[PDB]
């Protein structure tokens, strides 16, 4: 049945159907997010244009529905938007000051110092896979390998103690799940804020060799970051650094296992692993929808107008399936396509993902290490039967049962 | 493709297909349980006969595969069989001594003293549903209502402190999941044993108004139960009292919601709630397979012989679908059928479930309370899309998204 | 994807799906009629109760959406509600005065005088079928037989000249089609009003042996009907007398042709033709939705409240599929079922169809005459491929290709 | 079930299946046209050869079935063949005289004088779409835009008065529909002949600036056309000029809406509109079968022989799907294919469509005007559910429900 507003299903029962419908109704279309209306950008070229348009800001105070009190903290998606001041909420000249220390710490050269730590965690978790898969038993690749690894890496970078990481994982699972009761979710949001507040206090009194300390003590240059800004950057870096990288690792393994000819190309050195990672990001990336941007004034696109105060969502999954950019086979996984590295699954413009080099590095180490260690790894359950968790905006897989072979 | 040994799929990908194949290949057929062979009893009349045959015992030491060292603690299903001495592991005259105090405490008349406690827990968890479902939000009926309720009831009966119940739930989820690494599963089994050992120590020093204390301090009649026997009975009562009752509540709601005409019959008083519960137990009961029985000698059934030392599994789900007993519509949910209360989903013979009256009482209170409180309750996800957890022998649903209406 | 408001599709793409969804969400549920909200009564028992509830009136001025100017004449369904004063728009004591002369003229005994006229028209149109079907050609059963017949009968009863009937058919097709541009639809509504206004003028100056003349000149008893009341009754009698009877004839033929065993039962005298007509009315009747009733005050039904001013639609098709009344096979056509004549497809309460005896008489003459004349009549197109016309509230078939045989 | 004669289904229930079966059974195969046998040419190269073969003539008197009286005016397709003398019925030297005045009037340079008239009608009917689609209402693109436009254009060219065009539309709908009773169809054929006879009389007494007058008064050169020849040319020009162009406009919109990437290419100027029109003509053109040609003697094709007197049909739709000419993707709509302008959907040889430049001009004006005016135009009904009218030889769509957006 036809409707002009596409309701994003919170259970993610038909992700493929929604992504195709969003593309067909694009590049700009109305969507419904749990009773709240917004515009969705589903086209590649229009996304690049709007992601650099200074009239679209992240600040929730620019949202006419927030101004009128129509949307409140009872909205189950409010934790994705109504967050503390950070690089994720600011635009304009002040944005660069909130990003500079993080981008400096996340350059390829800076990450070379972190590479041996990543190698150690990959090796340790491969040992866990080996023990778990003994005697031909079925193993959850997510819980044993892909789920803990990015948390370990981002915790080492930021300075999160090893004993605290299980609690963070429990919090994020409740934070992202649509099934979490809203009173519990807001409570989890408060508990996470309290944890990172105390972590910043702990690093202020006793700084260490970690990014959090660098945010706290920026040394020469610029106004010091406020407590809210340090906590906000910390919160965004851990959340994204963990959530998105877990998805990239799992979807890459799923794509390569279901395309064994292409897995052979990367294992034999005919196609680079980073090219396989790029096509995974384009075809099956971590972000489904990015909430949210708001128009500070009317934005005229010629045929259509984005009214002042309207909310605008970047539908990165639909954007990756753009037929105008990638061709008629955009819905297929093909690491040999020429437009693989043309994706914008890390974003575009000022808010482009600062951890993109780290995400690429983690996947580029973990993936060949996994398939070299277990060359006969294969699913114990048909890959197409692996369901998504009920997470509206993130491409989160539930579990990944495999046999080591 | 045809095969003579039916492999029970650990991912529960096709439960309907397996149940029909087990019925078609029955009433006695060979099955494969994660590489271990056994016979499956899938016929109603043959089950009743074998459940009273004194030549089939629960003791794992009668298993020829256990005697020969072929099956070890590395088998992922070993926690269902190699357990402490209890009413679940003994046969013959000593069996009655390990059951008498429990059956005396679990009669319908004895349970009348527990009814107000059950009513309070149902009312409290319905309040949780109301808060979780505020503003039309989607609610997990399992996590908010059906999952905690039987744990609170069996904990009140046995004397498990309120603060310890979340840890028990965590243990049982790992105990039952096939995805749990076997070293972790064996550790959880050890941690559960340590908890219940200390609980018996705590109740020995300071007995209370609970069944555990009754097992510890009987009257002058009969030999006192050993420490192993008390712990063993306690472990079986909590595990079954929780695990099976959660499934009954969820499957009853699923069956009634997908058959609103039949839900109307029970709410309007034309069919009793206990009849709707009986048909749920027959059609979609908590136990899929019951492990395990072993022949002390050759058992001649006419057309076939069960060799001495062979393992025998009661496939209660397939048994409930017996067409010879229930008719050509055995695969349909119909609370008006005449053979509903003729099911043996609680077992038969000496090992018949001792908590059947409590399971019936919990469901008979919780179900009408749920539908009276939320008369417009309905699924937020198509009922047929609710998956089973990867638990081989138990009918465990993953989650139950609903709207209060 | 799940939604709490069921949008009635104007293209009638999935009538079966919508009818089942309306039943499943009933007996009272919210619907969307081309952007306008209303409640739909989809349950049999609740319909009978509300159709006799004096707090639900037909007068559009009781509609809060009409009072507030939210709904206007630009709404494509406004011609079904905002009509002239007649028996269709009034409730209470004045309702009986607007119905008495019509009900007196439409009793079974009064209709005996019209039977030879119906017989002549059936015979004439069967002759048309014979000529149209010459040399084995395909014939549109609708255009040649079922479409003109009820117009000729209701025109003979009301006094519509033979030469004017083709224009009336053209008007009604535009009136009912959702595809008609709204400015054109409003013009057709005005042209129909002008025609019937002049017809009443013509009958006032020169009365005849017809019902229209009877409405104009009653006896000394009671106040004479106003001009608006005569025109209004005339318009309702012609519209319903034509539109609904065409559908009944076509759906009866479709149901019997797709169930030749049941057609054999009526032709061989084991089941009466009026019973086959009753099951057609229950299973595939002319009315899909009846617009519209409005609550003069809050109506408490126990679990729900119909707010004052809300619009209430009788979904007669969904009501006919009531499983609580007709059993588990309610979606099947079965003239031997015991509940066939228990349908309320003619309505219930004061507004019950006054022409039901005439509709039954027309079908009871036409159907056996058709099958006696052409015993080998059969479809030239698969019956399930016959589409509905885009008419939201009426069960209107597009065309009915047959061969005479 | 296999048969050597392919029966063309008069209801067009499976047009895709028949077209593929005709191609698979080609390039020359037997078909059944409502009980009348003929040969069908379904291959591209064989069509070009036979369309220039002087042994295949249009004259029905060369048909052995017509000579023997086997086929008569009772055949429902006889109006496509047994027509008055015109350019459509003559072959050889006399053919050019019946075509010269028409081809001279239909050159691209001559049509430049008609372009402002086409622009005015497109603008007027776009205004009708705007009014019909007000307030988001569904609009029939056929009835409001595509159906009247070619009639207006061909009427302006030929000199048909504006007030007479609705009657012509009504006649042609009955003429083409297989559901029309044959006695009514022959009557419609007579009424059309009477209308065009009087139109030629009217233009003879008072000639105007139109093609009909040019046919009547050819000025210098050649024998004057007879009354039968003028009426015959007039009849063919209006019938084809209207019927085929309506189909081209609707199928082009359907193809572009279902391929939004390709619609973007033409709207952005990367592919010419005339290239999109060419691929629409190749893939989904107006003519399905062209009746009919007859062999004046035995025609030897090497492997097969067309016997003298046999009827030969050009299956232009199947011809457009020729895999030998267009490749393995011939069944796909792709305006970027290299063989798009290689189609013969306008025919080939002496009888090639004389109005091809006019059809291309009408579509090349109307299509960009439509999408420029309503850039967000989209279907209100799934495009694949738009059915064909029961017209055997013409690709006639029933209705085209859209929203303006
Ligand atoms: C694993 C693959 C990853 C993907 C596909 C991804 C993608 C994205 C996207 C789409 C955005 C928002 C762009 C927008 O505003 O529209 C973003 C922002 C961000 N990401 Fe990533 N990310 C990934 C991993 C990471 C990692 C490893 C980190 C490390 C901490 C990280 C930290 C951040 C932060 C802090 C922002 C906010 C930047 C800003 O708003 O200025 N992400 N990412
Ligand atoms: C909710 C529905 C329940 C079902 C369908 C069920 C079913 C069963 C079955 C099939 C057996 C084993 C029969 C055999 O040996 O083949 C069993 C045994 C047992 N059940 Fe239940 N059960 C339920 C709830 C409960 C409850 C509420 C308790 C309370 C503590 C309980 C405690 C036990 C114990 C201790 C045994 C072992 C008895 C023995 O081996 O002697 N179960 N049950
Ligand atoms: C062919 C089968 C027919 C069916 C299934 C049918 C059904 C109905 C229904 C459902 C209603 C409205 C009930 C309500 O208010 O909810 C109605 C009212 C009415 N019908 Fe019929 N009808 C049929 C034929 C006819 C015929 C032959 C006539 C003759 C004139 C007629 C004239 C009317 C009139 C005037 C009303 C308005 C009565 C009032 O509102 O008081 N209908 N009918
Ligand atoms: C809209 C797209 C059109 C298509 C695809 C089309 C196609 C055709 C075809 C296939 C034929 C017969 C070729 C044969 O004999 O096998 C034909 C003939 C003819 N068409 Fe068109 N036509 C179109 C539009 C028009 C228009 C706009 C006119 C203007 C009057 C027209 C007038 C004629 C006439 C008079 C003939 C007979 C020519 C002859 O037999 O010498 N057609 N057309
Ligand atoms: C959306 C995101 C996950 C959720 C993050 C978001 C950055 C801002 C942020 C700060 C919080 O306090 C909660 C999590 C969020 C909302 C991240 C940007 C890229 C990644 O996908
Ligand atoms: C199988 C069962 C769940 C697992 C229980 C079993 C009784 C014996 C038992 C004692 C333990 O220590 C672990 C759990 C088990 C193995 C129960 C009998 C009925 C219920 O379904
Ligand atoms: C709805 C109906 C068809 C449309 C009729 C309606 C009665 C009232 C009426 C008067 C009019 O002027 C237009 C048609 C309508 C709106 C009829 C009652 C039963 C039949 O189905
Ligand atoms: C077949 C046709 C439609 C019907 C036209 C035909 C040209 C000859 C002709 C003269 C008539 O009198 C009726 C219509 C017909 C039969 C046209 C040629 C191309 C177009 O498709
Ligand atoms: Cl990349
Ligand atoms: Cl029971
Ligand atoms: Cl009836
Ligand atoms: Cl072309
Ligand atoms: K666009
Ligand atoms: K593909
Ligand atoms: K050939
Ligand atoms: K294809």
How large is the C-alpha radius of gyration of chain A?
21
**Phi and psi for B358 in degrees, rounded to 5?**
-70, -40
Taking the mean position of all CA atoms in its chain, how far away is CA B66? 25
**Cis before B292 (ω within 30):** yes
How large is the C-alpha radius of gyration of chain D?
21
Residue C225 is encoded by which pair of tokens? 């009907």
DSSP B201-234: HHHHHS--SSHHHHHHS--SSSPPPPHHHHHHHH
Rounded CA gap, B256 and B252, in Å? 6
Rounded CA gap, A6 and A28, in Å? 12
Question: For residue B161, what are the CA distances in angstroms to A267, B158, B332, D201?
Answer: 55, 9, 41, 107
Q: Which residues contact B9 (CB under 8 A, 6 or more apart)?
A: B18
Which helix (H) or strand (E) is C247 found in, with range? helix C227-257
Q: If we measure between CA atoms, which residue out of B403, B382, B405 comes closest to residue B137?
A: B403
Q: If we measure between CA atoms, which residue out of B330, B329, B310 comes closest to residue B320?
A: B330
Q: In B155-304, at which residue ranges do the beta strands (DSSP E only) sit? A: 290-295, 299-300
Beta strand D139-140 pairing with D401-403: antiparallel
Q: Which residues contact A315 (CB under 8 A, 6 or more apart)?
A: A22, A26, A31, A40, A41, A42, A288, A289, A290
Residues with CB under 5 A from ligand 11 (ion): C 278
Torsion angle of C-alpha atoms B127, B132, B134, B140, degrees rounded to 10: -120
HSE-up of residue B198 (Cα within 13 Å, Cβ side): 8
Beta strand B56-57 pairing with B290-295: antiparallel
First to last CA, chain A: 46
Torsion angle of C-alpha atoms B327, B331, B337, B343, degrees rounded to 10: 90
Residue C361 is encoded by which pair of tokens? 């008489």
Does the beta-carbon distance from D261 to A324 stay under 8 Å?
A: yes
- Residue A112: burial class (beta carbons within 10 Å; 0-12, 13-18, 19+): exposed
Does the beta-carbon distance from A7 to C1 stay under 8 Å?
A: yes
Residues of chain D with a CB closer than 8 angstroms to some CB in chain A: 136, 260-261, 264, 375-376, 378-381, 403
Rounded CA gap, A331 and A323, in Å? 8
Residue to mutate among B7, B8, B9, B11, with most A CBs inside 10 A, is: B11
Which helix (H) or strand (E) is A314 found in, with range? strand A311-314
Rounded CA gap, A169 and A165, in Å? 6
Taking the mean position of all CA atoms in its chain, how far away is CA B2? 31
With b meaning 16 or more CB within 10 Å and e meaning fewer, what string describes C126-160? Answer: bebbeebbeeebbbbbbbbbbbbbbbbbbbbbbbb
How many other CB atoms sit within 10 Å of the CB of residue D155?
A: 21
Does the beta-carbon distance from A303 to D260 stay under 8 Å?
A: no
Q: Which residues contact C40 (CB under 8 A, 6 or more apart)?
A: C6, C22, C26, C28, C29, C30, C31, C289, C312, C313, C314, C315, C318
Rounded CA gap, D77 and D391, in Å? 10
Rounded CA gap, C180 and C171, in Å? 11
**Cis before A27 (ω within 30):** yes
Beta strand C401-403 pairing with D5-7: unpaired
**Phi and psi for D258 in degrees, rounded to 5?**
-80, -5
First to last CA, chain B: 46
| For helices D356-373 and D273-284, angle between their N-to-C axes, nearest 10 degrees | 110
Helices (H), A159-226: 165-176, 182-205, 211-216
Beta strand B36-41 pairing with B305-306: unpaired
Q: What residues form DSSP beta bridges with A39? A: A30, A312
Q: If we measure between CA atoms, which residue out of B296, B250, B281 comes closest to residue B343?
A: B281
Taking the mean position of all CA atoms in its chain, how far away is CA A388? 15
How many helices (H) does chain A have, and how many strands (E)? 17, 11
Do residues A271 and A278 touch, judged by C-beta distance below 8 A? Answer: no
**DSSP assignment, residue B388?**
B
Do residues A95 and A87 touch, judged by C-beta distance below 8 A? Answer: yes
Place of tokens 């809203």: A182
Do residues C121 and C152 touch, judged by C-beta distance below 8 A? Answer: yes
Does the beta-carbon distance from B261 to C324 stay under 8 Å?
A: yes
Neighbours of chain B (3+ CB pairs under 8 A): A, C
Taking the mean position of all CA atoms in its chain, how far away is CA B228? 22
Which helix (H) or strand (E) is D311 found in, with range? strand D311-314
Do residues A58 and A89 touch, judged by C-beta distance below 8 A? Answer: yes
Residues of chain B with a CB closer than 8 angstroms to some CB in chain A: 10-11, 13, 34-35, 74, 76, 128, 131-132, 134-140, 143-144, 178-179, 181-183, 380-382, 385, 387, 390, 399, 401
Torsion angle of C-alpha atoms C192, C195, C198, C199, degrees rounded to 10: -100
With b meaning 16 or more CB within 10 Å and e meaning fewer, what string describes C343-357? Answer: bbbbbbbbbebbbbb
With b meaning 16 or more CB within 10 Å and e meaning fewer, what string describes A259-280? Answer: beebbebbbeeebebebbbbbb
How many helices (H) does chain C have, and how many strands (E)? 17, 11
Rounded CA gap, B160 and B192, in Å? 13
**Phi and psi for D290 in degrees, rounded to 5?**
-110, 115
Query: At how many Å resolution was this determined?
Result: 1.9
DSSP A16-43: HHHHHHHHHT-SEEEEEETTEEEEEE--
With b meaning 16 or more CB within 10 Å and e meaning fewer, what string describes C384-404? Answer: eebbbbbbbbbbbbebbbbbb
Q: Find, in chain B, the residue whose alpha carbon is nearest to that of A387.
A: B387
Residues in chain A: 405
Identify all chain C residues contacting A2, using CB atoms and an 8 Å cutoff: 9
Which helix (H) or strand (E) is C108 found in, with range? helix C108-111
Rounded CA gap, C389 and C243, in Å? 12
Do residues C299 and C311 touch, judged by C-beta distance below 8 A? Answer: no
Question: For residue A41, what are the CA distances in angstroms to A138, A287, A307, D326?
Answer: 41, 13, 14, 37
Residues in chain D: 405
Residues in chain C: 405
Angle at A203 between CA A200 and CA A207, to 5 degrees: 150
Rounded CA gap, C88 and C353, in Å? 10
First to last CA, chain D: 46
Rounded CA gap, B243 and B290, in Å? 14
The answer to whether the CB of D251 is under 6 A from ligand 4 is no
The answer to whether the CB of B379 is under 6 A from ligand 2 is no
Do residues B87 and B98 touch, judged by C-beta distance below 8 A? Answer: yes
Q: If we measure between CA atoms, which residue out of A192, A148, A194 comes closest to residue A171?
A: A192
Does the beta-carbon distance from A385 to B181 stay under 8 Å?
A: no
Give the torsion sign (CA, A392, A393, A394, A395).
positive
Q: If we measure between CA atoms, which residue out of C230, C273, C303 comes closest to residue C365?
A: C273
Place of tokens 């590049």: A27
Q: Which residues contact C399 (CB under 8 A, 6 or more apart)?
A: C140, C142, C143, C386, D179, D390
Q: If we measure between CA atoms, which residue out of A168, A69, A91 comes closest to residue A351?
A: A91
SS3 D169: helix
Rounded CA gap, D280 and D286, in Å? 9
The answer to whether the CB of A391 is under 6 A from ligand 5 is no
**Phi and psi for C384 in degrees, rounded to 5?**
-70, -10
Rounded CA gap, B282 and B290, in Å? 15
Q: Which residues contact C317 (CB under 8 A, 6 or more apart)?
A: C15, C19, C284, C285, C287, C288, C289, C395
Place of tokens 């109760």: C49
- Which atom of ligand 1 sits closest to the CA of residue A153? 27
Rounded CA gap, D327 and B335, in Å? 60
Do residues D243 and D176 touch, judged by C-beta distance below 8 A? Answer: yes
Q: Residue by residue, what is the 3-state secondary structure of A77-92? A: CHHHCCCCCCCCCCCC
**Phi and psi for D306 in degrees, rounded to 5?**
-90, 110
SS3 C76: coil
SS3 C322: coil
DSSP C158-195: HT--GGGHHHHHHHHHHHH-TTS-HHHHHHHHHHHHHH
Q: If we measure between CA atoms, which residue out of C293, C402, C301 comes closest to residue C349?
A: C293
Which helix (H) or strand (E) is A93 found in, with range? helix A93-105
Rounded CA gap, C367 and C252, in Å? 8
Taking the mean position of all CA atoms in its chain, how far away is CA C96? 21
**Phi and psi for C378 in degrees, rounded to 5?**
-155, 160
Helices (H), D206-342: 211-216, 227-257, 260-267, 273-284, 316-320, 323-326
């Amino acid at each position: 049945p036809h409707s002009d507003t596409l309701t994003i299903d919170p259970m993610i029962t038909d992700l493929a159907g929604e992504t195709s419908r969003l593309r067909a109704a694009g590049p700009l279309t109305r969507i419904d997010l749990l009773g709240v209306p917004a515009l969705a950008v589903t086209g590649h070229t229009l996304a690049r244009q709007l992601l650099t348009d200074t009239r679209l800001v992240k600040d929730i105070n620019a949202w006419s529905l927030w101004q009128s009190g129509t949307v409140t903290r009872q909205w189950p998606l409010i934790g994705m938007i109504d967050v503390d001041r950070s690089m994720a909420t600011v635009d304009g000249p002040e944005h660069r000051r909130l990003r500079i220390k993080t981008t400096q710490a996340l350059t390829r050269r800076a990450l070379d110092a972190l590479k041996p730590t990543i190698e150690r965690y990959v090796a340790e978790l491969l040992d866990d896979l080996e023990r778990a898969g003994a005697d031909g038993a079925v193993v959850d690749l997510k819980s044993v390998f892909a789920y803990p690894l990015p948390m370990r890496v981002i915790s080492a970078l930021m300075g999160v103690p090893s004993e605290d990481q299980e609690q963070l994982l429990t919090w994020y699972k409740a934070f992202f799940s649509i099934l979490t009761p809203q009173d519990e979710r807001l409570r989890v949001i408060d508990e996470m804020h309290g944890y990172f507040t105390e972590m910043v206090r702990r690093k202020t009194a006793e700084p260490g060799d970690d990014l959090t300390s660098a945010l706290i003590y920026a040394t020469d240059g610029e106004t010091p970051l406020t407590e809210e800004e340090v906590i906000g950057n910390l919160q965004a870096l851990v959340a994204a650094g963990h959530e998105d990288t877990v998805s990239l690792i799992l979807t890459a393994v799923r794509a390569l296992l279901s395309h064994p000819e292409q897995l052979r190309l990367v294992r034999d050195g005919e196609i680079g692993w980073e090219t396989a990672i790029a096509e995974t990001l384009r075809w099956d990336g971590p972000v489904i929808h990015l909430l949210m941007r708001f128009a500070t004034e009317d934005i005229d696109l010629g045929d259509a107008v984005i009214p002042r105060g309207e909310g605008v969502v970047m539908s990165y999954r639909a954007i990756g399936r753009d037929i105008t950019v990638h061709g008629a086979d955009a819905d297929d996984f093909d690491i040999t396509r020429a437009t693989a590295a043309r994706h914008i699954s890390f974003g575009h413009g000022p808010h482009i993902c600062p951890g993109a080099a780290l995400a690429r590095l983690e996947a580029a180490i973990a993936l060949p290490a996994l398939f070299t260690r277990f060359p006969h790894l294969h699913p114990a359950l048909p890959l197409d039967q692996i369901p998504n968790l009920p997470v509206l905006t993130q491409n989160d897989l539930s579990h990944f049962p495999i046999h080591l072979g």
